[PDB]
Amino acid sequence: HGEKSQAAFMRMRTIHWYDLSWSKEKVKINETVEIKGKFHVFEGWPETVDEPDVAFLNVGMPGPVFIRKESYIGGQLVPRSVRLEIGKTYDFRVVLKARRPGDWHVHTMMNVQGGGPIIGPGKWITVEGSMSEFRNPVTTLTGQTVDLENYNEGNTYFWHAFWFAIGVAWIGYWSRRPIFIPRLLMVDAGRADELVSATDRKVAMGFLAATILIVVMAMSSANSKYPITIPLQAGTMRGMKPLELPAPTVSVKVEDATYRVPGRAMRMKLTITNHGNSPIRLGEFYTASVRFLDSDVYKDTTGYPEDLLAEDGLSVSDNSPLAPGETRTVDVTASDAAWEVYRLSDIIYDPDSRFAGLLFFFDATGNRQVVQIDAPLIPSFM
Amino acid sequence: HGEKSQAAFMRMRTIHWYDLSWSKEKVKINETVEIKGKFHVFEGWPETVDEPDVAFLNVGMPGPVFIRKESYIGGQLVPRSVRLEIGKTYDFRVVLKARRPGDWHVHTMMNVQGGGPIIGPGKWITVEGSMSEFRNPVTTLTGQTVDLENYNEGNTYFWHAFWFAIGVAWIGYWSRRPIFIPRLLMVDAGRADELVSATDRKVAMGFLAATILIVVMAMSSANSKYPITIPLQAGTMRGMKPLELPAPTVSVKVEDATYRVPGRAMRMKLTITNHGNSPIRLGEFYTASVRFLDSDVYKDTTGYPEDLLAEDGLSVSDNSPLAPGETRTVDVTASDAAWEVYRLSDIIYDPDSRFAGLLFFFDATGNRQVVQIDAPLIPSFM
Amino acid sequence: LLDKKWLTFALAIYTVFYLWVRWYEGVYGWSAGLDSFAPEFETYWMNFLYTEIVLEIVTASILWGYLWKTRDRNLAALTPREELRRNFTHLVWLVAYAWAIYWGASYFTEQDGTWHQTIVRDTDFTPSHIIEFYLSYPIYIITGFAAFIYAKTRLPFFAKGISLPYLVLVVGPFMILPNVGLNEWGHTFWFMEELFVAPLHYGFVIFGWLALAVMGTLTQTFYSFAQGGLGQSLCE
Numbered sequence A, B: 001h002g003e004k005s006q007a008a009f010m011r012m013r014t015i016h017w018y019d020l021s022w023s024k025e026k027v028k029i030n031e032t033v034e035i036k037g038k039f040h041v042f043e044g045w046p047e048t049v050d051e052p053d054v055a056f057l058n059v060g061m062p063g064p065v066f067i068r069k070e071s072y073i074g075g076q077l078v079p080r081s082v083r084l085e086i087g088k089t090y091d092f093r094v095v096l097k098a099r100r101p102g103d104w105h106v107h108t109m110m111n112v113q114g115g116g117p118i119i120g121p122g123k124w125i126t127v128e129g130s131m132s133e134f135r136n137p138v139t140t141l142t143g144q145t146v147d148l149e150n151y152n153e154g155n156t157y158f159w160h161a162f163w164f165a166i167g168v169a170w171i172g173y174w175s176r177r178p179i180f181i182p183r184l185l186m187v188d189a190g191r192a193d194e195l196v197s198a199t200d201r202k203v204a205m206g207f208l209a210a211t212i213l214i215v216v217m218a219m220s221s222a223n224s225k226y227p228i229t230i231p232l233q234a235g236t237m238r239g240m241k242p243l244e245l246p247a248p249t250v251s252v253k254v255e256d257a258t259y260r261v262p263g264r265a266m267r268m269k270l271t272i273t274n275h276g277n278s279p280i281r282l283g284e285f286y287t288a289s290v291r292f293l294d295s296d297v298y299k300d301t302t303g304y305p306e307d308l309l310a311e312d313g314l315s316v317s318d319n320s321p322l323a324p325g326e327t328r329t330v331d332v333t334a335s336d337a338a339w340e341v342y343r344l345s346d347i348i349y350d351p352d353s354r355f356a357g358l359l360f361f362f363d364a365t366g367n368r369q370v371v372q373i374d375a376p377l378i379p380s381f382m
Numbered sequence C: 001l002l003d004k005k006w007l008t009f010a011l012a013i014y015t016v017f018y019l020w021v022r023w024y025e026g027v028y029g030w031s032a033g034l035d036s037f038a039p040e041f042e043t044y045w046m047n048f049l050y051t052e053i054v055l056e057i058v059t060a061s062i063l064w065g066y067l068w069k070t071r072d073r074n075l076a077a078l079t080p081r082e083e084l085r086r087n088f089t090h091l092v093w094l095v096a097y098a099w100a101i102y103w104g105a106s107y108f109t110e111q112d113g114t115w116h117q118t119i120v121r122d123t124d125f126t127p128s129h130i131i132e133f134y135l136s137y138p139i140y141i142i143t144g145f146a147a148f149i150y151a152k153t154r155l156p157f158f159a160k161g162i163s164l165p166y167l168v169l170v171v172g173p174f175m176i177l178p179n180v181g182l183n184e185w186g187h188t189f190w191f192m193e194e195l196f197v198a199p200l201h202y203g204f205v206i207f208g209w210l211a212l213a214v215m216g217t218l219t220q221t222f223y224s225f226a227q228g229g230l231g232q233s234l235c236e
Ligand SMILES: CCCCCCCCCCCC(=O)OC[C@H](COP(=O)(O)OCC[N+](C)(C)C)OC(=O)CCCCCCCCCCC
Pocket: C013, C016, C017, C018, C020, C021, C024, C043, C044, C047, C048, C049, C050, C051, C052, C053, C055, C056, C059, C060, C138, C139, C142
């Protein structure tokens, strides 16, 4: 819900999310929904964004309407920040547990230490039930099971109320007598030395000694109880395992790319060379969370968000099968209302008019090839 | 002597020293002792430590009880800082010349520009003789041989004493007359204009002119003598040649790792897959300068420090030979007094409870394989 | 008569209006207020911004102009009892200023932290921002200016000169509003992380310090209270 405002070229060339899947579209309270997919770190990472040396796999959502039970990059849990390598493809998996009823737009996002949020596609997930039924149990290494919704809440309230009461008692003790104007007049007109006299000093000594003694006793008691404590666990985690993708058998060279101002379409001319031994066909163009599909070649079945999905938004001038070894140049047009709804047309406002995306090529048997394209995007006005 | 205080996880995952050797254990004055070995830069380098882009091969020792005659990374001398690559293994060689009699704990260490000292294993080396017998000769490109112990000492003493004498002469010249209270009274009560009169101004002019002239003449004389001088030679040295190790034929997956609090043992469950064509056996586990050995498989003969060596500290549940292609899961326990002496048990205080180490696998013929393992280290209390 | 029930209204108007504002932002925070380019955002928060800016400008102009036009020309012939009554009215103005300062600089500022700490900010005019900078700040600025003008135009102590502590207390917290430019500039450009303790925030802190001039302002009001009707009793 935080994208459509970021720069179009920055959304195009940071991170490409694909193979996204959602386990469920509608859940009950305490029910789990799992989000899977892959993201590729673009080679032409913008210089204004710091390299993803420190990155965190986050969830885009309006507060804890879900709780993040687990999150994985590769196959290993990532509760801390992680290091990503430019040009690598990683697979991710986020497990969410429903907490608050309603209709929520859930995004998978990557926060980069020096570049800000990179928001992936968002999907509407319905939560039904009552928040009062939500439980977040956890078992500690000390052998006790607690609910994270209310654990330590009573202790926190008690201690804060106790110390607030001590401070209020001090202030009220001094506030029983007249406060401002008579004391000001006494201090000004001659030496005061009358508004602070025993047993006021004795009361202050008692307050100070009691404060120190209570702090020490409370610390000792909180050490006898909970004798086993550990510090906060933090630190960027290295050695994220990237996907070992096979080398693509399709090479694509972008010969100019244009978009009409104003308009809802993007046009580019591609020289596609088919290696390997199977006839390929262009089935998809993904630019920034928007999938332009050639419906005659490929159809989406993973429940991709409709406002981000162009079922027939990809038109190829000659999308006949491309025989192996054969090279041809075609005009590819990606047109959909999403191009203007998600403000991908506002790249005219950007200080770097370059686009990047993913082309998905499909053969007859159905196996697909992913190739990455990037080129300057030239607006056309007449 | 500076380790056992650093964080256990940081000592575990920075740099792993192995194949360490010492040419001699007891030396005479002016005798040379050589320290050799390999160090591997851990892939999971902690984010709190700057990457070893600028690193210096140092020696941990109580002052110049030895002088560093030579130091090598790869096969080339490294008198300056060097650049190391994460994940690479380098071989090193430090040549030390004994200078001060006594029993010294000599460590090989790596200082990293933004992370501080990484201290390797330390070995007690005895030095016998007299410091007065120590010589540090060196031959310059100008064809003169000097002893670095006392070269230029007389000149330094002479010039410092000369300038100190000049300053003391100035102060005493002004201090022959009364100093503080009469001069203060003269300055306060009326205009002073009497305590600084000729020939005081003439003496000050003489002092200033003589100072400038002596500085110029001394610089010219020190340029006529030593006509050939070079600036200090500094600068990080790139292109350190790492060892080209063969790819290991053993793959190990750590399925949980635990240590008792309190305790002197660490337990982990490993899934070991034997590739290649020889039966392997687990012989060693090195975690942080501590070598846990399975005495039935391997014995140390390189004179490793005893307090860092656990001869039978490594117990494997099933350490029978592992046939090629066969995969088995075993429980590995590393137990020794060193685990508590070197405070490796204090990882419970650390904000990142993850360990790293090296497993050494040996076959029947004796050739060994080095595999690296890293996993979270979970304390157990009950 | 002396202190009258204008103090009750001074507390109640801010309390009720800001409770309604909190209800409004609780209802339209999500669901017309998350997406800054949705049409419903324009009808529920951009319209709110426009209406509140126009109403704040009109109210400030009317209130300040009325206070300045009804200024007491013959301050010399003011009885001590009337001066005491006017001092109490000025104290009511200061109470209203303190209440508005609380609502602006604590409640809606920190609630703002929560907002940013929970959502991806989509614009310089988040539904909540509209509430803080374009309401929790102009409202307290208007109240502070009105209190200063009332002191200057009804209290002989605060007449015949501009009180430095009052001017600081009134203008420094006002400088937080133009400081929003530094907030925006150093959110989009400088600093991309949502950290409340980032230096892009020291402009709010520096001018929040100037509210400490309330101490000098209040000792000045104490002296103004204790001019003719200082007692006796006090120091007697
Ligand atoms: C120092 C001088 C301050 C000046 C600024 C004051 C800002 C006032 C609010 C701006 C509203 C806006 O701009 O929006 C206009 C809103 C948009 O809601 P709607 O879509 O019509 O839904 C129906 C309306 N509900 C959602 C509120 C039910 O509707 C309105 O007409 C209602 C605005 C009522 C404001 C007056 C009540 C305040 C609480 C009572 C104690 C004073």
